Point group: C3
Chain length 156, copies 3
């Protein structure tokens, strides 16, 4: 009986590789972020965290209080999940939506699903990921950055 | 126990008429798309499809594999729905949110609801549609395109 | 068994103070709107209203039909809620997501939660609020306006 929503973006810049949903995808530009700018996992975390009312992943700091920072989005997701289960919550299902003009996400979706399903400890049927463009409109339309929205559903 | 989320946009261009939620709305510009750029139904489909974990409407191709393409958003929605029920899923409720500076959506909402309620086979009380502008900000603020977000809830 | 989604934005302009989630936050610019441009509550209302299928807060008019207009977002939220309960609906949980480059929302979240929890009559554990930026991208990236997304979950 708990719904959750997350949103997140990151601007392009830097050298090559970008990481999304935990997968390393080839691309001319890279993603600027304090950590691996995995917008997919950040949005997913915020969603999960939002449903359990623990307030975004930002509560997990950019203060790098000797514990969390210097850690990829995957570790933060597992950590946040560990705290959510602590409040006796169990995963119902999650849906992620990546918004980018490029690169093509479709081929990497399955592997993303494998990762998320591992970190949240569940089967892949409980996690869905899709991608969409903004038809060359917006900061996404241009290759300025990538955005991602995620909804989550937890059970008690 | 299944939540779903969808997002979708389309840029303006072309002659007159635009189609949204299945309704033909008068407007100076038109919507550029491979098929009738019905952002409302596409977002709705992705949402429904996301909850049943079948990965966006794009999995239904733009490869036009002799079967699906040359078909309006309404047919795709009914098809996707047919496949979702196949996995023993039944509709709970859906909410659509259209983001456009113009034209005015409010008057066409009721008819949109009729269409969606037909295609998904349910009563109108299980489908809600609303509209909002971006106060002349963004590619939506300008008359560059229309975007739409949709959430869905399926039951087993 | 009812999900709901809301979205809303407002452009900057005017003198000082902005109101978000019912809290008065210090800021160089202000928010242009027919009423206190509380994007957080508007998105929240639309969400709640969407789940009960009553079609956005705009159905509550900008026609100022002697009843509603000249009223802050807080009164509209309580009113909309009063009508939702009328249809025998009860609150399950809600999650809000504020998208702004500035000002910093994090410190005001707790108080926002207090307000929402009062207006909807429930405990704070049933209401979550978070904030995020667009890394200086988009009309939000620039200080052009503030946007906000909200999901809601109602029970019968
Ligand atoms: N307007 C904003 C935007 C983001 N934030 C906060 O800063 C943190 C990280 O924001 P970003 O994800 O945008 O970098 C979060 O904890 C969030 O609550 C804020 O307090 N006010
Ligand atoms: N960055 C992106 C954006 C869209 N896509 C894919 O292309 C298809 C259609 O995208 P559009 O709706 O943006 O036209 C979808 O199946 C989607 O998964 C992608 O693989 N990578
Ligand atoms: N394209 C649009 C955008 C908003 N609207 C309507 O106008 C009202 C308020 O819109 P804003 O929140 O964007 O100011 C709502 O009731 C909404 O349904 C519309 O009818 N068509
Ligand atoms: C650790 C954080 C904050 O520094 O990494 P970030 O790269 O900056 O990404 P962010 O979008 O800001 O989301 C919050 C955190 O993941
Ligand atoms: C058939 C598709 C893909 O060609 O039609 P499109 O018009 O292109 O619209 P789209 O947003 O890309 O959503 C996917 C499909 O509906
Ligand atoms: C009363 C309304 C409509 O005038 O106030 P607004 O300030 O204009 O804000 P809005 O975004 O348009 O949301 C609808 C209503 O809250
Ligand atoms: Mn991020
Ligand atoms: Mn589309
Ligand atoms: Mn508003």
């Amino acid at each position: 009986m708990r719904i959750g929503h997350g949103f997140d973006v990151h601007a392009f810049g830097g050298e090559g590789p970008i990481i999304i949903g935990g997968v390393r995808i080839p691309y001319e530009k890279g993603l600027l972020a304090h950590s691996d700018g995995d917008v997919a996992l950040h949005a997913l975390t915020d969603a999960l965290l939002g449903a359990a009312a623990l307030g975004d992943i930002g509560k997990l700091f950019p203060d790098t209080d000797p514990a969390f920072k210097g850690a990829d989005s995957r570790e933060l997701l597992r950590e946040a999940w560990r705290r959510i289960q602590a409040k006796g919550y169990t995963l119902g299902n999650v849906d992620v939506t990546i918004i980018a003009q490029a690169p093509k996400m479709l081929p990497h979706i399955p592997q993303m699903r494998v990762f998320i399903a591992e970190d949240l400890g569940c089967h892949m049927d409980d996690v869905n990921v899709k991608a969409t463009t903004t038809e060359k409109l917006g900061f996404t339309g241009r290759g300025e950055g990538i955005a991602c929205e995620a909804v989550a559903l937890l059970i008690k």
